[PDB]
């Protein structure tokens, strides 16, 4: 990453060998749970392209996903290259060039002009979007891995509403929907899946029902 | 979190991924008990709004509980936006505009502006306020993890008394309805529930009769 | 390896025992797959040649292996010695000499002549070429512990298209050959080798469709 | 209504007997189908709160109904008198006073006040704000008529895809959830919701599934 000196300037670092494995411990051990994706989110804070590029790369198996990410990273950076023209011919001295979509994805440049380029005044972060690249294919392949759909969770008849609503905010943090589609989910469907005993209960519990509430109800 | 220097002043530093492993370990084995907040405000001393919606995002499973820790903190959000309205035009040059209710959680806020307010003079403690508010969500979170009430506590005829003042104790330590009110109930309750032998052996030293006498007369 | 100390000059660290071990770990827990090159690379940031063949020789089995990566070693500084040719006569009070072939290769090159031609301005690359170097022979060896061929991945009666795929991508990362050939190849070998059942799923979609189409096609 | 006379001033007139023997039939003979609200739109156009509410209390039975909107313009009366304070004094001629809650509902002003504010120079919509008012209660009333759920439609096994989608539709426009929610349930629950046939011949469809091409494969 770039660590930033104490009364110094932001010194480049290597990625160090425990974030490596902290890395391929969690992808091998927990597979793709939604909450991977906040993990990698830390794991890697001011990482250049190369950094990321690294923790992509020794990713063991699951290579259908590897490719998914890599092929949602080349239509984010046709994107970026069809939206923002690249200038070209002599440059200025002091002043970097114009970063393309294949050099924003780092597979086209060194380490120098990343760094060069998250260091330029005004900065011009090339790790904050080629991580949100990699947060949209990491998105898209949690959704593909999700087993089961919001719209088809029926609570069992034995099976308690703890388990019920786990399972359920589980599929809700897996699902691809809008914001507000996933208000209007949380908000009706839960009660309106829920077993006809507790679903009655919380019909008698009636508006502004808040889970707490809910789960209080359902007891015993 | 922050950390100081030399010189004395502090930093931000990237979270260190021993503590992220720490806290999901202790999270998923230990579930929820009394003995997980002292576990996280022992983990997260200094840590950003950013550190603690890491440390909450990363607990996979338990979704229900998550989402009343979120629930509480938005209710606190907006108790705290209600109770102090920010000032709008123009800030000063030496002053840093003030958090929001919704910005104290860093939920639409960039870390350098955590890293400023927490750093500033004099220095605003949005972290400790994020933090106390956690807790107080961790609170009632392992409140609604409490199995039983105080109340429906009966040793049984072969249960000794060891394990009755165990459960006891546990179900108390996990109810926290008040500390006055648990100085009564264990006078009472701990008295009014044990096995006839044993029960009249405790009634021999009266009230007055403290712990370790009350339970070295039913040992051995 | 050396690393920038504070402040700003660069001091010879000698290569740390965790890193080794984590090296050994590597090579022993993952043998020969082709993330190791990633590992590898990362582990040894700005190493030193000593380091380097310190990292190589702790390494334990595989002797074949290690042979044809000297072997190649040889064989590169051999044509650096033809590319690069050395002039003899006496060094300049300031200037270091330009490196061989073995200098490269840290065989007869001690400690201090090769920290001299790292730090000294402007620098000589022989850590990268040295990495570049044993990256080319892990290469090699990569491509030569490949169990089947490519061409030979066909996919069983009920295997799903989850393994098929993945193991096709696998044994197609391990595959060595030019880019293009392998966007031929994904789009020619793929869909024919699939089983009918899910072939006529993926001929139904297209020719030129993309990966998770066909994945979530014949998902299930 | 007030008609607009050729090349001179709009004039007002009286209700048609024509008009009103249309709403009253319209409300017998439908009950309150979601096409209620258009007609009635339809039918008063320019029409005065008196016409509004004349229009309103000709309704005979549905006293349940009428007596929900009645509430609801009470809300929407009490809303603006809350958000708009209102002038008082003496008021310069020519210009009318501020419209009060209780006046453009109507219920506390006369007829020369309504064509007033309806006709002063920049004119207030009185009448199309009521008729706001009225449509919103109209919109509840037809919630509360919906006989079943949106969430609840299963096609049946002999029942065509064709009657299946009717339902679904009209169920649709009888929904409350907002237009962004309502597009992605249609979205999803009408080829969620089909019997099994028709729902591979759906998925094969795959995306991008519109209205015609769906009805067109469901055929036979």
């Known amino acids: ?20 494995n902290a890395w391929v411990k969690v992808v ?29 790369n020794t990713v063991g198996g699951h290579q259908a996903a590897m490719q998914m990410l890599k092929e949602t990273i080349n239509e984010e950076a046709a994107e970026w290259d069809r ?22 994805a780092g597979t ?4 120098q002009e990343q760094i060069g380029w998250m260091t330029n005044n005004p900065p011009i972060p090339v790790g904050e979007i080629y991580k949100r690249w990699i947060i949209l ?7 593909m891995y999700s087993p089961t759909s919001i719209l088809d969770i029926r609570q069992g008849p034995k099976e308690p509403f703890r388990d019920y609503v786990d399972r359920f905010y589980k599929t809700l943090r897996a699902e691809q ?9 949380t908000e009706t469907l839960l009660v309106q899946n ?3 005993d507790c679903k009655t209960i919380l019909k008698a519990l009636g508006p502004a029902a808040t889970l707490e509430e809910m789960m209080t109800a359902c007891q015993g």
């Open 177 to 185: 929907a809008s914001q507000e589609v996933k208000n209007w989910m």
């Open 1 to 20: 990453p770039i660590v930033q000196n104490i009364q110094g300037q932001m010194v480049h670092q290597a990625i160090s060998p425990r974030t490596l």
């Open 137 to 143: 294919g990491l998105n898209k392949i949690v959704r």
């Open 194 to 196: 829920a077993n006809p």
């Open 83 to 104: 939206v923002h023209p690249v200038h070209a011919g002599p440059i200025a001295p002091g002043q970097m060039r114009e970063p393309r979509g294949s050099d924003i």
């Open 28 to 56: 091998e051990e927990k597979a793709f749970s939604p909450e991977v994706i906040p993990m990698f989110s830390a794991l890697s804070e001011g990482a250049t392209p190369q950094d990321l590029n690294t923790m992509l």
């Open 108 to 111: 086209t440049s060194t380490l």
